[PDB]
Amino acid sequence: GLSDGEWQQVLNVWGKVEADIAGHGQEVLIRLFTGHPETLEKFDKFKHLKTEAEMKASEDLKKHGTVVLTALGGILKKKGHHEAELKPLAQSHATKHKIPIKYLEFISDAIIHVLHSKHPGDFGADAQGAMTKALELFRNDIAAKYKELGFQ
Ligand code: HEM
Numbered sequence: 001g002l003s004d005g006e007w008q009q010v011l012n013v014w015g016k017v018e019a020d021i022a023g024h025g026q027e028v029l030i031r032l033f034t035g036h037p038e039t040l041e042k043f044d045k046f047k048h049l050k051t052e053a054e055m056k057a058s059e060d061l062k063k064h065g066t067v068v069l070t071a072l073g074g075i076l077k078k079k080g081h082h083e084a085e086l087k088p089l090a091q092s093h094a095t096k097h098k099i100p101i102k103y104l105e106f107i108s109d110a111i112i113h114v115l116h117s118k119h120p121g122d123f124g125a126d127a128q129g130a131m132t133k134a135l136e137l138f139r140n141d142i143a144a145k146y147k148e149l150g151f152q
Pocket residue numbers: 039040042043044045067068069071072088089092093097099103104107
């Protein structure tokens with residue numbers, strides 16, 4: 001649960017991402033894959049990537065970063081009223097992709113990391129607080145659907 005002022009911070013931060021969605025999406029995925037190599041094994045289309053240089057050179061990885069962040073941005077713009085947008089993603093991630101909730105924690109922290117790396121000194125403590133709370137809400141509502149489905 002976020003206040004109006006917190007949502008305002010979230011959507012202000014998101015403007016930084018929307019200025020270069022593919023570059024942010026690429027770096028988020030590279031941070032996830034290099035920090036948590038078990039996550040790469042869930043992607044049949046990226047498991048061939050052995051080095052970070054290959055990851056950086058991959059245009060399909062940048063494409064997928066655009067897909068991921070476009071979906072997250074659409075959810076964030078709903079300011080918590082995201083049941084319809086979140087349900088298909090929860091279902092696909094539990095039943096088809098088999099993504100444990102832990103990996104959603106990993107990517108949440110990776111987003112925070114990338115924001116500081118690309119905007120050092122321009123991602124303030126209030127903005128970090130609000131973004132963290134928004135990603136927690138997203139993760140918690142997915143977790144509720146995972147529990148319904150019995151997925152661990
Ligand atoms: C911010 C969180 C994320 C968002 C919004 C997101 C969004 C999406 C979207 C929109 C798709 C394509 C449609 C679909 O299959 O439902 C997708 C595919 C996928 N997601 Fe996620 N995702 C997230 C986190 C993750 C994480 C943490 C993993 C794995 C560690 C992951 C693994 C996958 C896989 C395996 C695919 C299928 C890729 C394919 O083969 O082309 N997702 N995701």
